[PDB]
Each structure stands twice: as C-alpha cells, then as structure tokens.
Ligand binder design. Structure first.
Ligand SMILES: Nc1ncnc2c1ncn2[C@@H]1O[C@H](COP(=O)(O)OP(=O)(O)O)[C@@H](O)[C@H]1O
Ligand SMILES: Nc1ncnc2c1ncn2[C@@H]1O[C@H](COP(=O)(O)OP(=O)(O)O)[C@@H](O)[C@H]1O
Ligand SMILES: Nc1ncnc2c1ncn2[C@@H]1O[C@H](COP(=O)(O)OP(=O)(O)O)[C@@H](O)[C@H]1O
Lengths: 112, 112, 112
C-alpha cells in the first residue's frame, strides 16, 4: 500500500479525478493548500517587515492505492496534472503500514 | 513511532478526541478536507463541462503515537468514528522516522 | 528523500520559510490546521453536550528534502519556530519512496 500525495494546480483537479476513475480508483481525499516555489506571490514591505500580499492556491490530492497500482496512479496523475508551465507541482509517494475502512473493519487492500 | 491518519465524518470528531484522550494521547492535529468515494456529491453540466455543485466535508485527524500505542489508537478511532453508514472513512498508518518537539528539543517518544 | 512535516504557530511561518530559504530549499507546501494539546481552547456545555468555542490555529509546513538535507532542515525549522512557550508544535519526518515533478517528469532529487 502507498499514499500517493499530489500537489497540483486547483484547476487540474477535475481532470485528475477523471484519470484516477479511469484506473479504477474508488475514491480520494482533497485538501486546500498554499504553494511556495519558483513561482511566487507578491510581497510588500511595511514598517521593517515583509508581508505576503498574494498567495498561490494548490490542491493536495491524497490517495491510497495498492502496490500493484501506485506506479500507474503516479503516471496518470502526472499526465493529468501537467500543463507545461511553471507551478505544475509535485507527487510524493509514502509507504502505508496499515489501512482500515472505518465502516466495515476491512483491512489492507480491502480497506482501500 | 507512527502517524495515524484518519479521514472521518466531521461530526464524529468530538467522540474521536474523547477515545484518544481515554487512551492517554496528549494531543492531535486536525484538517478540513473534501471527500470523494462511493458516497458522492451532486454534479451539474454547463456548457460541455461537468461541475461539482455539492461537496462532502471530512475531517482529517493526524496523530503521532508510539509503536506501543498505535494499534490501540487505530482500534479506538475505528470504534469511535463508526456509524455503519456509507462514508465512514479511512485510517492510514505511516511510519515516522524522527520526531521533534519544537519547544523543548525532546525527540522520539518524548517528542510526542 | 524525506517529507518533513512541521506543525507550528501561524506567526512563525515567515521566519520558517526564511531559514529554509537560507538552506537552499526551493519551495514548500503549507496547510491551515487546528491544534489540540496541553494548550487547549475554551469549551462550553449546552444541553448535555460540550462544544468547543475557541480553536488553536496552526500552520502545517510540508517540505520534501533529500537525505543529505533533512537533518539540517529539521534543526533549522526547530530553531526558527521556537518561542519557549507552550504550543510551539511538532516536526515529524516520514520517508518518501518516490518523487515526481509534474512539469518536467524529473524524479528523485531532481523532483524536489
Ligand atoms: N520542497 C517542496 N516540498 C513540498 N512541496 C513543494 C516543494 N517545492 C515546491 N513544492 C510545491 O510545488 C509547487 C510548484 O512549485 P514551483 O517550483 O513554483 O514549480 P515547479 O513545481 O513546476 O518547479 C509549489 O507551489 C509548492 O506547493
Ligand atoms: N483511495 C482513497 N484514498 C484516500 N481516501 C479515500 C479513498 N477512498 C475513500 N477515501 C475517503 O473515504 C471517504 C468515504 O468514502 P466512501 O467510499 O464514500 O465510503 P466508505 O469509506 O464507507 O467506503 C471518502 O469521502 C474519502 O474522503
Ligand atoms: N500526538 C500528536 N500528534 C500530532 N500533533 C500533535 C500531537 N500532540 C500535539 N500536537 C500538535 O502540537 C501542538 C502543540 O501542542 P501542546 O502540547 O499544546 O504544546 P507543546 O507541543 O509545546 O507540548 C498542538 O496544537 C498540536 O497541533
């Protein structure tokens, strides 16, 4: 099991859920985040301090898939979230030790 | 050390913090998220595009516990977050390589 | 590769991004969260239920760095986020199995 964590542009999310659905992935969990990177917001200095005046929204997609699916999931998200412009974002893969589906108690692959 | 990540229904959170407190867990960190799964929101098509018009709020509980507590923490959250209805959510367990408490520099178990 | 996850006080974020920038870290991802711990919000009881009436905002910094940088990143964040008062927060380190930069397909260290 893996937790694929993808930090994408908020407008690429419909296309991302689509690819994932084309792969057979039942569901996912989404978070709103602010991004900092090469592409940065505007700053302002006021009284010896520099304050951020604009922010770069991103969407964090967090999806648990099996060891047989993650590599395909990574590739799918990469292709689905790509624009070719700076700020496209990241995909990180972390290892899931255990998984539980709260409704049924199902574990491992059956929890996803 | 483990990071227990639980994606639950937002109204089951008071009951979840309670169980965790009954286990001796000092604290936790909570995030607001949108869920997608079997239980889905409503959609709308407008001009060759399908837009989501309703969303399913979930709460993400993120709690670091020791290797001697995580299995009990998982079980507690599972029982505390269960309703028996579709959408109860997930619990994922990931491995924590290092931990630091910012205030005191305490590490490992003493950081939690 | 590691995902350094730091749960800090929201006003220590400018100082945190600064240290990270002094270390050569290109970017990071930030989330708004609620904290529960020793330092707690106010509660209220109404009709046989206890409701939370105040909340403790925290900022979650999530930054992927290489195996040669993480220990320095942890230390930097610890020093940059420290106040000496209760509620300073946590830093957790998790292992990243794979990394992809969506724009270019670059992997591993080149993805960060
Ligand atoms: N070290 C990092 N850890 C976690 N997320 C990052 C990191 N660097 C960048 N990001 C995320 O990637 C997004 C894009 O960063 P940017 O460098 O502007 O473009 P690109 O990813 O195309 O190089 C950022 O807004 C940020 O959310
Ligand atoms: N593959 C997944 N990865 C991460 N979170 C998921 C995944 N599948 C479902 N979830 C989360 O679990 C919640 C419940 O999903 P759903 O399938 O509707 O009910 P159940 O979990 O009872 O089967 C979703 O709203 C979503 O937040
Ligand atoms: N077990 C835990 N798992 C994840 N985050 C935690 C945990 N315990 C505390 N935190 C986070 O650390 C913050 C500070 O907790 P608190 O105990 O009040 O102060 P301190 O970290 O200085 O002991 C909390 O608001 C919470 O967000």
């Amino acid at each position: 099991m893996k937790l694929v964590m993808a930090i994408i542009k908020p407008f690429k999310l419909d296309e991302v859920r689509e690819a994932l659905t084309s792969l057979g992935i039942q569901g996912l969990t989404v978070s709103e985040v602010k991004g900092f990177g090469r592409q940065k917001g505007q700053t302002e200095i006021y009284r010896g301090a520099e304050y951020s005046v604009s922010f770069l929204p991103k969407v964090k997609v967090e999806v648990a898939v099996s060891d047989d699916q993650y590599e395909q999931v990574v590739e799918a998200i990469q292709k689905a979230a790509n624009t070719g412009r700076i700020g496209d974002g990241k995909i990180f893969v972390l290892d899931i030790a255990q998984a539980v589906r709260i409704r049924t108690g199902e574990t491992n692959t059956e929890a996803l």
